[PDB]
Amino acid sequence: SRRAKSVEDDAEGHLIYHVGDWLQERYEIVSTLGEGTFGRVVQCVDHRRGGARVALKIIKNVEKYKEAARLEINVLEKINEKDPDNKNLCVQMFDWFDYHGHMCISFELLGLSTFDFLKDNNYLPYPIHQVRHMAFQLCQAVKFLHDNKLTHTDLKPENILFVNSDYELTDERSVKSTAVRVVDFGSATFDHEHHSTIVSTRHYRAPEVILELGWSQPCDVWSIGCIIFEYYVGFTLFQTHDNREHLAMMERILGPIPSRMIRKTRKQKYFYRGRLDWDENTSAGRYVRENCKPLRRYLTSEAEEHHQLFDLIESMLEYEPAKRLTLGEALQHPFFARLRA
Amino acid sequence: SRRAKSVEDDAEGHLIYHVGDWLQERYEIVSTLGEGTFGRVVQCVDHRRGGARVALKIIKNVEKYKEAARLEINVLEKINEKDPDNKNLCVQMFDWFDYHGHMCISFELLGLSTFDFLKDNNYLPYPIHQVRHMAFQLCQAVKFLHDNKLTHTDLKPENILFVNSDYELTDERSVKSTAVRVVDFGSATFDHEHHSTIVSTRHYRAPEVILELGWSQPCDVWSIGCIIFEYYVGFTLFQTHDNREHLAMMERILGPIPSRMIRKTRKQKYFYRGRLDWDENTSAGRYVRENCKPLRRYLTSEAEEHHQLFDLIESMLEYEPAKRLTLGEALQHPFFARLRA
Numbered sequence A, B: 001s002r003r004a005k006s007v008e009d010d011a012e013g014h015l016i017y018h019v020g021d022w023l024q025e026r027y028e029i030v031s032t033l034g035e036g037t038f039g040r041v042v043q044c045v046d047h048r049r050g051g052a053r054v055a056l057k058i059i060k061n062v063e064k065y066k067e068a069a070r071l072e073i074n075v076l077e078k079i080n081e082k083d084p085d086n087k088n089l090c091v092q093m094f095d096w097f098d099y100h101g102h103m104c105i106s107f108e109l110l111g112l113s114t115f116d117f118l119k120d121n122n123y124l125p126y127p128i129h130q131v132r133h134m135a136f137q138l139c140q141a142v143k144f145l146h147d148n149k150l151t152h153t154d155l156k157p158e159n160i161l162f163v164n165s166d167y168e169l170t171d172e173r174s175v176k177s178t179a180v181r182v183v184d185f186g187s188a189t190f191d192h193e194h195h196s197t198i199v200s201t202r203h204y205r206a207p208e209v210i211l212e213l214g215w216s217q218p219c220d221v222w223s224i225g226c227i228i229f230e231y232y233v234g235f236t237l238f239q240t241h242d243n244r245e246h247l248a249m250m251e252r253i254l255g256p257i258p259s260r261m262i263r264k265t266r267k268q269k270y271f272y273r274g275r276l277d278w279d280e281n282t283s284a285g286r287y288v289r290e291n292c293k294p295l296r297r298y299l300t301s302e303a304e305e306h307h308q309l310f311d312l313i314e315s316m317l318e319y320e321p322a323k324r325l326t327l328g329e330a331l332q333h334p335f336f337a338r339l340r341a
C-alpha cells in the first residue's frame, strides 16, 4: 500500500478488492495488471464464459472518469458493430457493467504494453523489423478508427499492447511476436461531438493542439510519428512539460513553425515579431539545443530501410495538419513494402 | 526528466528554470528542494537581502493552484500581522510576487520535513522524548492558528519541517534538534469563509469530514493525533484510500461510531440498520482486522510516559468533534509536563 499525498490523490476513488473476490457472481479476481488515472485493470476468470481469462478494467467511482468510461463503452460498441471478427486490430470488449458506481469493462487478456516491454528491457530500442511491423499495425488500427469518423487523441506506447509479450534472452530481451492491439478509448472522439481543447499526453501532443487551432484525425498521425521514433531510439522525442519549450524543441528538430499557424493562434504569448519567442542563447536555450537535434540525426544506420523509416516519421511530423500524411498514405509508404507482400 | 502519463499530469503547469537563473533580477536559483501538486520549492540566494539563502515556492500557472496561493498569501500576511517576532512556530514568509502567472513565495530556508527525515531513516520511529517535543510544538503552532479563527485542514508530516535536520549516526539516524515549523497554508480556512466539503489528505481526514457533517478547528486536532501516532510507530495509522474501509478501520482501532453521527450523515450509503455496513467475515473484513488493532496495542513500552502519550492520542481521536480535545487542553496534558518546566 502507498502513501496519499494530497487532498486529490490518484489513490482515491478506486474499488477495494482482494484476490479471490467475485464480481457479479461471475468474475474471479486473480491478480492486478496495472493502475492508471482512470482506475485499475485486473486479471479475472470469467465463469459465465468457460473459465476464460479476461482483463477487467475497473473505473473509479468519480464523475469525470465515469463519464469518460460511458463514452469509451459506446466507442467500443460501434467498433464491434463495424468489425465482428476482431480483424480491425483494436482490443475486443466482451461485456460491461456498472458495479456500485464503478464501470467495469471486460477485455481479452493481452500482454505487456509496448512501453512497459521497452522499460522492462532498459529502454533498449526495438529492432527495425519489429518497429516496421508494430508501426504498420498501429497505422491499420488507427486508420480503421479514422475511416469511421473517429480520433483516438491519446495514442502512446502504454495504449498499444502486445497480444503476447513472451520473449527470448541474450544481456537482452527480444519479443517473440510483435502482434499488437490499440486500447483506451476514453478520450476517443467522433467528428460531430464536442472536442476538448487539450487532448493528448504531452509527449505526443500535436502542434495544432498546443496552439488551439482546432484538431481532428491528423493529430493522431502526429502521435503515431512520435511513437515510431520512440520505438526506434528507445526514448521520447519531445521530453518536456512546457508549451514554449515543447515548441522550441519542435523547431529545432523539425524546422520552423509556419507563420500561418503563429498568426492564427490565440496563444499569441509564445510569439514575438511573428516568430516563436525563444532566445537560443539563454540557459533554457542551451538546454534544448544540447538535448535534441534535427530529426534525421537519430539514425542508427545508413541503410536505405532506415532512411525510409525516417521519411515516414518526417511526413507524420508535418506541422500543418492538412498537409500532414494521412494514414491511408501511410500504409502505402515505401517503408512497409516488405509487410504488404 | 520524467514521463508524463496522462492528459492531466502533475508534470504540467510548472515554471521552467535551470540552476543559475535569476528571477526579478533578485533570486538566484541554486537547487530544487522538492515538488508537490502545487508546484516546486527551490533554494535561492536573495540578492536584495544580503545573500540570504531562502526557500522559494513557485506555484503552477493554473487557476486552482493560483487561487489557493493567493489565499495562502494573505493567511501568511495575517500571521505576520499577529506575530511580528516569528515566535508563533509557523513558517516565516519574507515576500511574494506574481511571475508571469506563477505566484512565488519566499520563506526562510528550513530542513527536511518530519516525514522525509523518517522515510530517509527507514521509517524507524522517533524516540519518545523527540515525539514529545515535536507534538508539543505542533500543538502550539496550530493553537495559534485556532486562536485567530483559522483551520489549517491539511496537517501532515510533510507539512511540518525541522528548522535544521542535521543528525547523528549509530545503523541509525537521530536528529540533533527537534525544533520544527508548520508550512502550507493553501487550504487554510477562516471561520467566515466558504468551507470545502472534503479537506484533508486521506490518512489525516477526520470522521466528520468523511461523513460531511461540517467541520472546523476540531478536524485539525484529529490530524494531529494521527501524526503523533505516526511519529511514534513510524507508519500511518489509517493506511487506506476508501471511505468505507477507513471507517471500518476507525471502528476497529477506536471503537464504534456514534449513532448520532451515523444518523445525521447524508452519506447514508455506508450504513445499514443504524450501524456501519461492514461484514467482518469477508476478505475485506479479514484485511482490516489483520492490518490494525485497538489503539493501545501499538505501545512499545509499559512505562507511564508512554501510556500518557496514548491518552493524548486517544483524546485527539475522539469521534465527536465537540467532545474532542481542544489544543488548549492539549497543551495542559500530563504528557507535556516535562517541557512546560
Ligand SMILES: O=C1N=C(NCc2cccs2)S/C1=C\c1ccc2ncccc2c1
Pocket (backbone or CB within 6 Å): A033, A034, A035, A036, A037, A041, A055, A057, A091, A107, A108, A109, A110, A111, A112, A158, A159, A161, A183, A184, A185
Ligand atoms: O482500455 C484500456 N485502457 C488501458 N490503459 C492503459 C494503461 C495506462 C496506464 C496504466 S494502464 S489498458 C486497457 C485495457 C486492457 C485490455 C486488455 C489487457 N490485457 C492485458 C493487460 C492489460 C489489458 C488492458
Ligand SMILES: O=C1N=C(NCc2cccs2)S/C1=C\c1ccc2ncccc2c1
Pocket (backbone or CB within 6 Å): B033, B034, B035, B036, B037, B041, B055, B057, B091, B107, B108, B109, B110, B111, B112, B158, B159, B161, B183, B184, B185
Ligand atoms: O509552503 C510550503 N508548502 C510546502 N509543501 C510541502 C510539500 C509537500 C510535498 C512536496 S513539498 S513546503 C512550503 C514552504 C517551505 C518553506 C521553507 C522550506 N525550507 C526548506 C525546504 C523546504 C521549505 C518549504
